[PDB]
Amino acid sequence: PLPSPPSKTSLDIAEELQNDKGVSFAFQAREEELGAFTKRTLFAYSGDGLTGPFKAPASAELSSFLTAHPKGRWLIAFPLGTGIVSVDEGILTLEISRSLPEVGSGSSFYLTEK
Amino acid sequence: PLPSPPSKTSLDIAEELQNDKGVSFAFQAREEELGAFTKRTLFAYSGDGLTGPFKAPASAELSSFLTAHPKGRWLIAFPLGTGIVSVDEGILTLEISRSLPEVGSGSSFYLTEK
Amino acid sequence: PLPSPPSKTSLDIAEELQNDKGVSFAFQAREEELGAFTKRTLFAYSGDGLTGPFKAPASAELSSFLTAHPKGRWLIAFPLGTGIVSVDEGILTLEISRSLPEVGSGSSFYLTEK
């Protein structure tokens, strides 16, 4: 009874990153298009604790997705703190508000008509 | 090996709202049906900071979706604070727990067998 | 222009749980497969407040999904506090960081290449 515009998933990729200390993250990058809008979502998960910023090489494809954000960085909520994800010259950085004894999972999206 | 009931997406719409001060939000309203259940999710994003409640006219369709919530309001977590979204006579209000230097993104859902 | 591996939703189920005091939760369990990766997401919603841990019998299927987590428990963010979901002998427990006047909604996922 309420109508919808057409929609599709135009990107859905995942990648595992690991830093020099053996901490590992999985990231998923998703793009949905719906009508005039595009939504890009970053999902992040680690089983590990994190005692400082997480830095690791990212693929060209993930790097492209991450750099597209209108602010060049992704504010992300995890259960025990906040992070910021950004990429520079193919290196992902996740900066954190506080040490995280468990990172858990979170997501960050932007949704635009541009 | 674990079975699922049938499911579908019965609604997926998005809309851009802007207040008198030039702050802009994108909202997405999604309905999933799975077996006996219906899940309605509100996604919200702004690149802007928010220095007080956000108020703006919403479409009839978005207003209908928002008013359906069993509490008549949507509790929503953003990375830096909490909000409540409600609608009255076609005007959306997002009230916030604290000033937000960046709103970022968040979602709020309800899931029911009714 | 950016390629994706194949993906599908391999599980999507929902269930309503109720404790001895009449508090009720809806849980949704979803599995996505994308390329090498599997993502398992638990969605949780209650309209009720919660004044202590929520305990209730869960189906064998939900119990199976919950026990699969690499930590045997799911750290979950709600708007007003944090929880941990686990299952033992078919009884779900949601432990909470603080009393919640409204639980609202939240989700917890893990994403792995195993």
JSON list of C-alpha atoms in Angstrom, two decimals, chain B residues 30-69:
[
{"chain": "B", "resi": 30, "resn": "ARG", "atom": "CA", "xyz": [12.63, -0.07, 5.35]},
{"chain": "B", "resi": 31, "resn": "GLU", "atom": "CA", "xyz": [10.12, -2.83, 6.06]},
{"chain": "B", "resi": 32, "resn": "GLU", "atom": "CA", "xyz": [11.10, -6.51, 6.00]},
{"chain": "B", "resi": 33, "resn": "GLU", "atom": "CA", "xyz": [8.60, -9.32, 6.45]},
{"chain": "B", "resi": 34, "resn": "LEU", "atom": "CA", "xyz": [9.92, -12.73, 7.53]},
{"chain": "B", "resi": 35, "resn": "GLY", "atom": "CA", "xyz": [7.55, -15.49, 8.46]},
{"chain": "B", "resi": 36, "resn": "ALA", "atom": "CA", "xyz": [5.17, -14.23, 11.10]},
{"chain": "B", "resi": 37, "resn": "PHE", "atom": "CA", "xyz": [7.29, -11.11, 11.75]},
{"chain": "B", "resi": 38, "resn": "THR", "atom": "CA", "xyz": [7.57, -7.62, 10.45]},
{"chain": "B", "resi": 39, "resn": "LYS", "atom": "CA", "xyz": [10.65, -5.46, 11.02]},
{"chain": "B", "resi": 40, "resn": "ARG", "atom": "CA", "xyz": [10.51, -1.71, 10.38]},
{"chain": "B", "resi": 41, "resn": "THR", "atom": "CA", "xyz": [13.85, 0.12, 10.37]},
{"chain": "B", "resi": 42, "resn": "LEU", "atom": "CA", "xyz": [14.55, 3.84, 10.29]},
{"chain": "B", "resi": 43, "resn": "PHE", "atom": "CA", "xyz": [18.05, 4.79, 9.11]},
{"chain": "B", "resi": 44, "resn": "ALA", "atom": "CA", "xyz": [19.25, 8.35, 9.68]},
{"chain": "B", "resi": 45, "resn": "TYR", "atom": "CA", "xyz": [22.36, 10.21, 8.49]},
{"chain": "B", "resi": 46, "resn": "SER", "atom": "CA", "xyz": [23.61, 13.77, 8.56]},
{"chain": "B", "resi": 47, "resn": "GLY", "atom": "CA", "xyz": [27.04, 15.17, 7.78]},
{"chain": "B", "resi": 48, "resn": "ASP", "atom": "CA", "xyz": [26.20, 18.23, 9.84]},
{"chain": "B", "resi": 49, "resn": "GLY", "atom": "CA", "xyz": [26.55, 18.95, 13.47]},
{"chain": "B", "resi": 50, "resn": "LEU", "atom": "CA", "xyz": [23.40, 19.50, 15.36]},
{"chain": "B", "resi": 51, "resn": "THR", "atom": "CA", "xyz": [23.12, 22.20, 18.02]},
{"chain": "B", "resi": 52, "resn": "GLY", "atom": "CA", "xyz": [19.44, 21.59, 18.99]},
{"chain": "B", "resi": 53, "resn": "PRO", "atom": "CA", "xyz": [16.42, 19.55, 17.87]},
{"chain": "B", "resi": 54, "resn": "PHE", "atom": "CA", "xyz": [16.03, 18.99, 14.15]},
{"chain": "B", "resi": 55, "resn": "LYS", "atom": "CA", "xyz": [12.57, 19.82, 12.80]},
{"chain": "B", "resi": 56, "resn": "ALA", "atom": "CA", "xyz": [11.45, 19.58, 9.21]},
{"chain": "B", "resi": 57, "resn": "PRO", "atom": "CA", "xyz": [8.46, 18.67, 7.07]},
{"chain": "B", "resi": 58, "resn": "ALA", "atom": "CA", "xyz": [8.25, 15.01, 6.10]},
{"chain": "B", "resi": 59, "resn": "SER", "atom": "CA", "xyz": [6.30, 13.38, 3.27]},
{"chain": "B", "resi": 60, "resn": "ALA", "atom": "CA", "xyz": [2.96, 11.72, 3.96]},
{"chain": "B", "resi": 61, "resn": "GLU", "atom": "CA", "xyz": [4.57, 8.36, 3.25]},
{"chain": "B", "resi": 62, "resn": "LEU", "atom": "CA", "xyz": [7.45, 8.85, 5.69]},
{"chain": "B", "resi": 63, "resn": "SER", "atom": "CA", "xyz": [5.05, 10.30, 8.23]},
{"chain": "B", "resi": 64, "resn": "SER", "atom": "CA", "xyz": [2.83, 7.19, 7.92]},
{"chain": "B", "resi": 65, "resn": "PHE", "atom": "CA", "xyz": [5.82, 4.88, 8.46]},
{"chain": "B", "resi": 66, "resn": "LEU", "atom": "CA", "xyz": [7.03, 6.85, 11.51]},
{"chain": "B", "resi": 67, "resn": "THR", "atom": "CA", "xyz": [3.60, 7.07, 13.19]},
{"chain": "B", "resi": 68, "resn": "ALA", "atom": "CA", "xyz": [3.16, 3.28, 13.02]},
{"chain": "B", "resi": 69, "resn": "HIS", "atom": "CA", "xyz": [5.73, 2.63, 15.77]}
]
